[PDB]
Design a protein around this ligand. Sequence first.
Ligand SMILES: [Cl-]
Ligand SMILES: [Cl-]
Length: 221
Amino acid sequence: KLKAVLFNMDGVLFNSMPYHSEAWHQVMKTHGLDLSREEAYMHEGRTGASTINIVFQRELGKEATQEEIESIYHEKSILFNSYPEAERMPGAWELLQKVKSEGLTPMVVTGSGQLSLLERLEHNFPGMFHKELMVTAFDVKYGKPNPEPYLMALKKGGLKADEAVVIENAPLGVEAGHKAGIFTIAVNTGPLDGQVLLDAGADLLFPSMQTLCDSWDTIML
Ligand SMILES: [Cl-]
Ligand SMILES: [Cl-]
């Protein structure tokens, strides 16, 4: 039944998670808030505004103001962009070529609003993605772990949930894919215990994008 493969971006397509976790950790530290690199990784999937608000609630016992959200989001984006630009996750391009050769539609479903990465998708993965077949921070009211972004991806692609598969590296994205009713494959590309991804609702778990790519033609959907 499979028609489309819905990829997260950060930690699936780009090896950008060390940078995102460093930048969140450092900007929060500047603001006097403790967020470890691993706790930052655990927020992958959220929009930046949702991350900031939840960290304020957890650490300060209050909501972030709109000004705090915009300031901190810009600060983190500027710091992220100050690093040498993120490179591809090994295995992603090989997998995309396989998916496309099988007649399947690649899509991106991300909580990112980071234009530096979004505008590099075409040069990194030529011929794969299209803006009207992507969901980003710009498209959603509620991001991951709410199923909204994955539900929206299904609609953009004219798909039913049973015609798609989700490829996720982070538990909030796994949860969103699963709760959207879509079969969800976790790829453990970061510092987390794989069990965190299984417990978030992943139907399958692979230890890298390359191993997923190697097994791809035996996943019968
Ligand atoms: Cl990382
Ligand atoms: Cl960013």
